[PDB]
């Protein structure tokens, strides 16, 4: 596809704000990937650079990305406890049963690192609590699992 | 002063016997072809260590006397038991006293003795012990481990023994190495290149507790913390210490053969100013032995005396020192389980430390006379030789010649000590410098019981020893730093012989037998400490001449008083009388 | 003479090529990057040893050549065999003959050379073995070990096998950490602690007698007695010495390389003098040979040799200098297993010590006309190399193969040049090679198939063999308050003939007993009994003379003449005397 | 017959004073009103120490003060069962001469007699068989001095036994 494409992913990847809008506004590719199917989504989301999601999204980027092994924006921004992208995620559309290739969720991933902020947004927005993954595993069974009863009480 | 060499190595929850005769009999028949050894002495205790002392002509560069050795002990690693091996020896070429005291405490009580020594063990001892100068580091306290603290009812419930936990934490609990995609050689056309991650090490006792013991046959899981409680701490338990009375730590060092006493002081102390800035708030170095306005004070109890007797004298120091002579004493940093020459529950050390010179003006208030008047005030404490002494007789081995045994030369010993009693105006205070045998619980593990009813003895033996001694399984990261991980029986189930008969044993067709069923057990008496000297076994002796009465005649009498022993029972000179 | 490092190892019934294969080269390999060494040579040998000598130029730092020596042993140590590590890896810097050698004998008879052996290896060796200025020191004889001989038939008998054996006495001559009662961290209030002492290792017959190998279904026990005899013995049984025909042991020992002769000698004495009062009844010191006054007198038969063959040699040796030269010789220290190569089964060495220069006037009673004599009078001996001398215009050449062709072809070589020097007289004498000729070797192959196909394992199988024919070091014991080993080998009588191999049992994962000859088979054929290598490749010393008059120079060239139509792949080097 | 352990000042003085052979002390701490029966923490008495240290003269000084002869420590184990283990003639006869019970068994079911005959103590067999020793005496694990004999292969004892 693009040069520009590349440079986007590096962009995301480092959190550089404004190299990101510069290199948007000269026609990057959003969706560009890279080998392991990671979007400048996808970057953004795991090291929690905020502004760049934002920026991403209102260019276009698909919300619902998934990578060589199925997973999503948001399963990233779940999983490494970045609240603020978890809601602008879910704001812009992520599919909040999104599962990957292992049939893991947004929420079994909340749940295993005990994000509990995050696991009651993603219940908020419609998250299945019965979700199992390939294992029969639901967000309740890594709370038993885990032994974290906070998060054992918000899942009831 | 004669360099000295010397090997230490441990082997957690061994006797003075096991210790002796699995590991140093088998170092000492290897100390061959080392040059200017004039003499190597032995210690082998029921701490579960061994310290093996090897003195070198008087001239003898002891960089050179240090590398033989190791080299020596390099070629015997492998004759050595894995528990050993695993634990790392050591090798040291330092003067026996310490040049100083580096004692850490928390000023805002945030931290215990416990969380302030695996501070000290996990951020300062290291790059302390890498600064030149450095012979040996003391720990005063233990790092932490990862200690699983196993319960024999809840193990015995599922069918579980501690093999069955060993083998969980190894299988879980561990570091793999598993290659790369695109990893070479490649196919072509390949774009991609990745590690591949799998297990690695676990870094929390919330991790550890998730291990998975078992599935039952109706599919409920037992994990480890179902038998288990699951605490960061020390890899020992045997030293704690004080200053001026509140928790501390510290680091106890002695200086390298032949480095310079106040270089050496210099660097440790700018190597702690790089340290400083980082401590968790509370966290303060104060400094209790700086070597004249110093002095230290031995606390040595009867072999049997266990920690809190220990204790109960050194807060009588302690006392001494900061009540009675509080105008002349700044502070007292007392070792509670350390004692100068070895490391026991009957033993201590504390490190006194005075106010300036200036302010202790008066010949009563100068270092001789207060360690005079501390020696008398603390000569009448009971069953305990307590002595305070800045920092010569003779110094006497009496030593098995001709395969005798322990219990033979103690026979051969107490008749030449009884002896030497009879000549008062020719010798005064002959004595053992070692430990009186104490009781122990021998217990006979039945052979016939064991296989009738499928009882593997390497399940009794780890059970036993893993249990009531603890086991190293194998490491883990704390906070980014390697430690180790060990599993023991929580204290309540370790403490008395009835408690021998609740630890149970899975036989080959899955039924659960006590410990009970295929054993027996008595009180005997043995050695806490077994003693070497030139690779034979040995009693060291200490005494002075009388008043009016020269060195030379006393060792004469002593001379004349050994070629009257049993058969078989030699002696020899050492130390000061060589 | 140069400095030399020399590393020892040993592997309990191993054969030249699997010393060579699991042990030597795996060494040598790493014998680079060591400075000042001029080269290195190494003997592979059928009697499970390995000896790599590492010359060093003239005025090295002996401490600083064993360290670097050591320092890149020590890659090769985990990629040994466990049961070469286990038996002590050394590393030495001594002198390459003997300073002095300290005999002991018993006076009153009460006590064979095998218990005057184990005397000496009990209570003497080690201290003198730490003396400063003691490079080396060898045993004439072998310290005791527990000595479990294994009866077949017995054990087929039991559906037990080695492995069993092997396994129970690791079970019960053990020694076990068992921690304490009331150790800490203690429940606060503790008054209890005491050790707790559960097996130890057994340090007696009677206690290994009584291993318990197995519970019968009726209840009957089999015990270790019932399927061995069991007694002290040496570790091994290849040397023997003689003192004036008289049961002996001794201390053969090697001067530390700088060290002071004299002042080390002195020091011997002074540490033997700290053990004689101890000496159980009729024991003593006598000194056959202190370094004229003395000389030796070497031993060599060909390989094959038995033991029978080198004592009847060694007889006659000693017979000569009681009865030929009574009133020159004092004494004669006789030892059958070890010679200047170092130990073997046809090798010995008689160490000649002669009476006072005052009692022996004349000139042909002096120690040069007696070795002379002796020399002479051992010539006609045959199949054996026996010669007498004190302590020059020789050449030292390695054949070396340089191209992988392979012991055999190296032979076939070697052969050649040597065939082409005995048409040289003029230039070339006594033109022959240091070493040993390949000997018969029973070849067994274990057929995988069948062994799969009984469910018999091939460790089993290994095992079995290895131990049986071969012996296996177990574990320790204690022997009067010392660490010692235990062995496991067959009673003699079961490993004698080739029939026994099929008289062994292996056990099958169905319970089944599987005698050896199910899945084996067998057929002679010829190997080495003693691989040498040069600077890390095969070869082969070959030892000369420059002819009467003519220059080692000229030898030398003549023999890079001969030497330079070999076949490809072969090549040479000089070493020792020649090198420079 | 299981005495407790007293920290008292004169019961450790003795204890310390019966296992270090020192008669005359004994007898000094015996006239100043010392508990004969004082135990250490694995409840064994001056007369457990005497016996298994061989102090004869202590053990016969003891008894004449009351010293219990059948005294238990924590496992069930007398002054007997120590001098038979340990091959001290003259205290096994003193010790049954004052009414020792030649067939108290330990905690493990173990007697005098199992100890002695262990050991191969073959006078000590003898005597404790002549008063009134159970031969056939059986411990927890079904065994017999017969049983030792044989697995021990100590024939001269087997023949003692018959």
Same mark, same amino acid.
């Given at each position: ?37 990671? &979007? =400048? /989504?996808? @970057? ?5 650079? #905020?502004?760049? *999601?934002?920026? +991403? !999204? %209102?260019?276009?980027? $698909? ?8 997973? &999503? =924006? /948001?399963? @990233? ?5 970045? #609240?603020?992208? *978890?809601?602008? +995620? !879910? %704001?812009?559309?992520? $599919? ?8 893991? &969720? =947004? /929420?079994? @991933? ?5 994000? #509990?902020?995050? *696991?009651?947004? +993603? !219940? %908020?927005?419609?998250? $299945? ?8 595993? &639901? ?15 918000? +899942?009831? | ?578």
């Amino acid at each position: 596809g693009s040069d520009l494409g590349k440079k986007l992913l590096e962009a995301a990847r480092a959190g550089r704000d404004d190299e990101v809008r510069i290199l948007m506004a000269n026609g990057a590719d959003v969706n560009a990937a890279d080998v392991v199917g990671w &979007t =400048p /989504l996808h @970057l953004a989301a795991y090291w929690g650079h #905020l502004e760049i *999601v934002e920026v +991403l !999204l %209102k260019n276009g980027a $698909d919300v619902n990305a998934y990578d060589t092994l199925g997973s &999503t =924006p /948001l399963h @990233l921004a779940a999983h490494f406890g970045h #609240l603020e992208i *978890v809601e602008v +995620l !879910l %704001k812009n559309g992520a $599919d909040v049963n999104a599962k990957d290739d292992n049939g893991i &969720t =947004p /929420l079994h @991933l909340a749940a295993n690192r005990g994000h #509990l902020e995050i *696991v009651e947004v +993603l !219940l %908020k927005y419609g998250a $299945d609590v019965n979700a199992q993954d390939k294992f029969g595993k &639901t967000a309740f069974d890594i709370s038993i699992n885990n032994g974290n009863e906070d998060l054992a009480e918000i +899942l009831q | 002063a004669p360099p000295a060499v010397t090997i230490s190595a441990s082997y957690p929850g061994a006797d003075a016997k096991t210790v002796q005769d699995t590991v140093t009999q088998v170092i000492e028949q290897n100390m061959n072809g080392i040059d200017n050894l004039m003499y190597m002495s032995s210690n082998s205790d029921s701490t579960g260590t061994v310290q093996i002392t090897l003195t070198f002509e008087s001239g003898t560069d002891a960089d050179i006397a240090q590398v033989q050795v190791q080299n020596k002990l390099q070629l015997a690693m492998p004759l050595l038991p894995q528990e050993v091996q695993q634990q790392g020896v050591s090798v040291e070429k330092s003067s026996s006293s310490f040049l100083m005291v580096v004692g850490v405490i928390n000023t805002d009580g945030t931290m215990t003795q416990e969380d302030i020594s695996d501070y000290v063990a996990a951020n300062m001892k290291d790059a302390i012990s890498r600064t030149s100068g450095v012979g040996d580091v003391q720990l005063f306290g233990s790092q932490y481990a990862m200690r699983i603290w196993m319960n024999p009812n809840e193990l015995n419930k599922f069918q579980l023994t501690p093999v069955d936990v060993i083998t969980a934490i190894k299988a879980q609990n561990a570091q793999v190495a598993a290659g790369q995609l695109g990893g070479t050689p490649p196919v072509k056309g390949q774009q991609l290149n990745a590690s591949i991650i799998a297990q690695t090490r676990l870094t929390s006792t919330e991790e550890f507790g998730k291990i998975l013991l078992k599935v039952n046959q109706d599919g409920s899981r037992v994990l480890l913390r179902d038998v288990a409680k699951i605490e960061l701490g020390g890899e020992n338990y045997d030293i704690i210490a004080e200053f001026n009375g509140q928790p501390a730590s510290g680091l106890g060092i002695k200086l390298a053969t032949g480095a310079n006493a106040l270089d050496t002081a210099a660097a440790i102390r700018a190597e702690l100013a790089k340290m400083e800035p980082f401590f968790p708030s509370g966290l303060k170095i104060v400094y209790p032995y700086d070597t004249q306005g110093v002095f230290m004070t031995m606390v040595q109890l009867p072999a049997g005396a266990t920690q809190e007797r220990t204790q109960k004298v050194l807060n009588e120091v302690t006392h001494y020192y900061l009540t009675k002579e509080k105008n002349n004493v700044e502070s007292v940093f007392a070792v509670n389980g350390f004692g100068f020459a070895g490391r026991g529950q009957n033993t201590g050390i504390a490190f006194v430390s005075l106010k300036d010179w200036a302010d202790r003006p008066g010949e009563e208030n100068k270092v001789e006379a207060i360690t005079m008047r501390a020696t008398r005030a603390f000569s009448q404490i009971k069953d305990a030789m307590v002595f305070a002494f800045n920092l010569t007789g003779f110094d006497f081995e009496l030593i098995d010649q001709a395969g005798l045994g322990h219990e033979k030369l103690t026979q051969a010993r107490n008749q030449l000590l009884a002896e030497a009693a009879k000549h008062p105006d020719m010798l005064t205070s002959v004595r053992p410098n070692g430990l009186e045998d104490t009781p122990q619980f021998k217990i006979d593990i039945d052979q016939e019981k064991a296989q009738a009813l499928g009882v593997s003895i390497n399940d009794i033996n780890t059970t036993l020893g893993a249990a009531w001694g603890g086991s190293y399984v194998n490491d883990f990261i704390d906070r980014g730093r390697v430690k180790k991980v060990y599993v023991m029986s929580e204290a309540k189930y370790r403490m008395l012989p009835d408690d021998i008969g609740d630890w149970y044993v899975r036989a080959a067709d899955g039924q659960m037998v006590p410990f009970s069923a295929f054993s027996s057990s008595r009180w005997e008496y043995g050695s806490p400490r077994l003693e070497r000297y030139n690779g034979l076994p040995s009693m060291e002796i200490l005494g002075q001449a009388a008043p009016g009465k020269s060195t030379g005649e006393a060792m004469e009498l002593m001379e004349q008083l050994a070629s009257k022993l049993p058969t078989g029972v030699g002696y020899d000179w050492t130390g000061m009388s060589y």
